Design a protein around this ligand. Structure first.
Ligand code: K5G
Ligand code: K5G
Ligand code: FE
Ligand code: FE
Ligand code: FE
Ligand code: FE
Lengths: 545, 538
């Protein structure tokens, strides 16, 4: 440990972690147990004999290395594999499907080897290498839990943007993130991030957005520059997002004055290239500056779908995404997409009708575990569910909390058993006396106050738009009871619900009492009602009069 | 172009006078009424004056002069051009007016302004600093400058302990002085200018992010910004200030002195302000800002959301309804409208449903409205019975009730909108906003719609929490037994079936029916059931 904020020296960094080789292109070593080890980041080819040396100072046996984690495919994060895997018999390489496929293409591996060979020292000779498609690889998927060791459980997270394959690794026990290049190149002289967007900007920014939601970080480890800790590593993701949008503002401003991509590429190179001269030929750095300046000019918002440039932008984008939809399932799909973008796992949408007064129908549709739907409806938990009933009394969102469920212990216990441990519920009353409710749920993160206030707005807008579209599509869940009254029957009922008898209506409307009672009979027939009272009460409850 | 930076007209009501580096802004309030903004530097006195005589036929028509803060580069012209504007009121923050009474502050200003003359110019006649025709303004004060110029004052301490900014709500135009910083003409980003307090600087930028989306942003240096640059101005300035904070903290964690980064910043920034700032004061101000930042920066080991947080914080502590309505007025005028209304439509009597209203239209039109019971057949209110979408006022909407629309137009209520919401007790509450001369432009429409939705939600919540009478409904209370009996009767059950299900006698049940009727002043069971359903009681 130290009082420093950046640890950037070969050797030990934490009670389970070591930096091997050159701090510029480090390889990280994890002690999963007494005789079990793992590696992280693949570094560059030319360090093969350096890295090896350092490794043998900590590990008594290379056969005890069982796993090697690789963020992405670029030549500077997989160059050591072909040379050191022939020495690590028990190792599995772990990479994203795209990465494992990239190692099978002759073209990509040829690029990798050309760039890695450009990096040898004076009269350097390379030790024997094995085929790229001969590596002992096992592909991983987004969200997969890697049970490396008893105290090393790491989650895979897709972080496309930097490249079309990039992934990062979250050690949740120590709140430690291996982020590779997805945040960029850390400026060692200023303390800010240098964006590295080399495939897609929307995906880059959406990835940084999804990463801002992780628990507060204590340790942040990019592919270059060592390990960051404290505040520097806690607000890392937000800081990378900020610096990317700052470069966007710079580029767009310069282009509004008439500058070319190459011009700002040369300007940026002048002030940045100096850091990566040891492992990156200057011309590839300039070309990457030009490439990223290409993408930014393509996808950045000018200065005049759902995304990044302010809230109103997300609002209009959501609306525009929902206009062409003529199929309800797609409506629900878009809603799900935005719910996940908020940071939750499941959601639900419920409608509470006002009748029958003894047992008011409460219909539900969502994406909770189907078995929970079976149990919920089977035991009709939906009658006195606090999340829905709060809407009868308040227009505020209700964040799920033990105190709120004091009256309904069984429901809360069973929902907790199904993973629905954290969530929130917003209510809104449609203009037809209906109680519509929108709930969101996740597994392990409690709603922080700030995110609570954020949610309230985003969910309000989503549910407000959703009910509108479902009314335009006449969904069966909302259709309640399709009853249309004629103008005459409606005003007859308007009088009757005010207490008038057949005779008084006959007088007032200037028609006969027989006509009025026949109208009453028709009205009854529509409501499937046995008398006038049920018709009047349901019509009042349904807003028809 | 995206940045307008040339002397002369900038908009149909605005002109830039003098040097774009230290500009002075001119507003045409009317045919023979004008106003100024920014006090510039002394040495431009004869330049600016020239340009002024190109636009104003008579110098007596200049009636107001607005001053952001006391720095020498925003008040230097006053002693020299106020002697030429007989009818002008200077408008400034109290601290500024006090600074003008202290001999020391005026001496600093005078020395720094003298440093900037050319070896040729002679000084034109000048008046004393404590003799100026000054009028103090207050944070939030409404300045009814002109028929189409209603500007609000906003306190923006931080850059200096007195800084204030001015917001034209009609044009969504903000004069911000230096509270956001010095706009980088070569890069398009903000350079922080923190010369008094960092917390106040950042809180000022926060309060400014809460304004409606900006179309025109006018700092003390560099001209007028439009488009995206003006929308996220406050957000970007906030961000760049925190970026400088982290740069400083990192360098200090490596063992650098402030002098090092101060000289760096001078080398890379001072060139912009060489014409109006002696280089050594630029280095010293960089050092001052880096000192303040090093003092207050946190050690180590989106505008809409801000508006929302601010409104809530403003409306929770209030426990008296009149103040609630007052806050509503504040935000409505801040958006750019003149009057508002809040209405409640009860569901009964079904033939003559009570429609109560509270707002700020001319009392005579309310007399007229109720006199002709316009609340029954007002289309803006009736749209809420079938839709939760906002309604922009339009002839098609009012084709059905032409008389009401014609008379409302006669009173100036020519442009407006109305939002509907359903309180949790089956009441239809609606919120309207209105002005006279400007049509609702497309982008501001959706921004408005959203803000109105939020405001009315919180309003109905708070007034229910305050137990207002207009929301109060017919006071009838039932117990579980009689309530459940009514739940059964409203489901179509007869007296006998109810008695069977509840395990009591039928005489008991019909006597219960009488109980229920007595409260509603109802003649039979049907009226009771319908009113109970309409009131949400069963
Ligand atoms: O969100 C709601 C109201 C609607 C429930 O929607 C559901 C319930 C089960 C299956 C499905 Br699909 C949707 N209630 C919360 C309370 C805590 S658990 C829960 O469902
Ligand atoms: O805003 C409403 C509803 C009426 C509420 O306004 C009023 C009416 C009387 C006194 C007061 Br205060 C406010 N209607 C619109 C329709 C077009 S003009 C108009 O006022
Ligand atoms: Fe990379
Ligand atoms: Fe890299
Ligand atoms: Fe200033
Ligand atoms: Fe200034």
């Amino acid at each position: 440990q130290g009082h420093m904020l950046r640890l950037s020296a070969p050797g030990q960094l934490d009670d389970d972690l070591c930096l091997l080789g050159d701090v510029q292109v480090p390889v990280f070593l994890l002690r999963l147990g007494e005789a079990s080890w793992a590696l992280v980041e693949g570094g560059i080819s030319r360090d093969a004999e350096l890295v090896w040396a350092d490794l043998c100072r900590w590990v008594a046996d290379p056969s005890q290395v069982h796993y090697w984690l690789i963020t992405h495919k670029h030549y500077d994060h997989c160059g050591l594999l072909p040379y050191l895997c022939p020495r690590l018999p028990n190792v599995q390489v772990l990479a994203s499907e795209r990465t494992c496929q990239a190692w099978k293409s002759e073209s990509a591996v040829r690029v990798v080897e050309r760039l890695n060979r450009q990096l040898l020292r004076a009269e350097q000779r390379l030790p024997e290498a094995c085929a790229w498609d001969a590596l002992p690889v096992r592909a991983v998927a987004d969200g997969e839990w890697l049970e490396l060791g008893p105290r090393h459980r790491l989650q895979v997270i897709e972080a496309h943007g930097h490249s079309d394959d990039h992934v990062v690794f979250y050690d949740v026990r120590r709140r430690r993130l291996f982020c590779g290049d997805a945040l960029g190149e850390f400026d060692e002289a200023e303390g800010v991030w240098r964006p590295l967007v080399f495939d897609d900007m929307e995906a880059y920014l959406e990835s940084l957005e999804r990463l801002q939601r992780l628990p507060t970080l204590l340790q942040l480890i990019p592919g270059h520059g060592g390990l960051l800790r404290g505040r520097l590593a806690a607000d890392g993701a937000e800081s990378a997002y900020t610096e990317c949008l700052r470069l966007c503002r710079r580029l767009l401003w310069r282009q509004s004055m008439g500058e070319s991509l190459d011009e700002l590429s040369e300007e940026l190179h002048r002030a940045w290239g100096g850091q990566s001269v040891d492992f990156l030929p200057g011309e590839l750095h300039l070309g990457s500056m030009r490439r990223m300046l290409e993408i930014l000019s393509r996808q950045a918002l000018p200065l005049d779908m759902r995304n990044d440039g302010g809230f109103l932008l997300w609002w209009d984008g959501l609306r525009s995404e929902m206009q062409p939809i003529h199929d309800s399932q797609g409506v629900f799909a878009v809603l799900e997409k935005e719910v996940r973008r908020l940071g939750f796992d499941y959601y639900a949408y419920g409608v509470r009708h006002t009748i029958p007064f003894t047992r008011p129908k409460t219909e539900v549709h969502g994406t909770y575990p189907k078995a929970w739907l079976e149990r919920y409806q089977m035991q009709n938990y939906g009658a006195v569910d606090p999340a829905i009933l709060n809407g009868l009394r308040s227009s505020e969102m209700v964040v799920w909390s033990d105190s709120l469920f004091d009256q309904s212990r069984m429901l809360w216990n069973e929902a907790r058993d199904w993973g629905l441990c954290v969530g929130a519920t917003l209510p809104i009353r449609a203009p037809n006396n209906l109680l519509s409710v929108l709930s969101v749920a996740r597994d392990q993160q409690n709603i922080s106050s700030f995110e609570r206030e954020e949610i309230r707005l985003r969910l309000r807008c989503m549910i407000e738009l959703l009910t509108q579209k479902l009314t335009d599509l006449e969904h069966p869940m909302l259709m309640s009871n399709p009853v249309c009254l004629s103008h005459r029957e409606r005003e007859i009922l308007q009088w009757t619900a005010d207490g008038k008898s057949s005779g008084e209506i006959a007088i007032i409307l200037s028609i006969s009492e027989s006509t009025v009672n026949f109208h009453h009979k028709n009205i009854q027939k529509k409501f499937d009602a046995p008398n006038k009272t049920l018709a009047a009460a349901y019509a009042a409850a349904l807003g028809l009069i």
